[PDB]
Structure formats: structure tokens, C-alpha cells
């Protein structure tokens, strides 16, 4: 079983950009996540007027 294929091994995390080759590195990876959440939230809100009306 190839260690680089299994995601729980450090070989996968180093050979895929997940692991630094740390905290600032993770912040660099996770930039723009809030924007994606905001966009999906906006689409969900605009995709069901009736359910918001039921909410009110």
C-alpha cells in the first residue's frame, strides 16, 4: 500500500502541499474560505424567497 496515497500519512501531506516543507502556512492555505462561504450563503438566501418568508 503506497504511503503517499493514504491521506493520514505525512508522505501525502508533504507531497500535496498540505504540510510545510506552519500556522501562517495554514492561514495561507485557508485564505478565501470565508469568501466561498459568503458566496454559497448568498446563493442559498437568494435561491428560496419562500423559505425566508416562512422564516419571517
Amino acid at each position: 500500500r503506497n504511503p503517499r496515497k493514504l491521506k493520514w500519512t505525512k508522505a501525502f501531506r508533504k507531497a500535496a502541499g498540505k504540510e510545510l516543507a506552519e500556522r501562517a502556512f495554514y492561514k495561507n492555505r485557508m485564505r478565501g474560505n470565508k469568501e466561498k462561504d459568503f458566496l454559497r450563503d448568498k446563493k442559498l438566501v437568494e435561491s428560496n424567497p419562500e423559505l425566508l418568508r416562512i422564516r419571517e
Partner: peptide, 9 residues
């Protein structure tokens, strides 16, 4: 060793 987790952010 683990690094920074999703919860710890």
C-alpha cells in the same frame, strides 16, 4: 507534529 487543525482556527 499534527500542525494546525480546522477547529484551532
Amino acid at each position: 507534529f499534527m500542525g494546525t487543525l480546522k477547529k484551532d482556527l
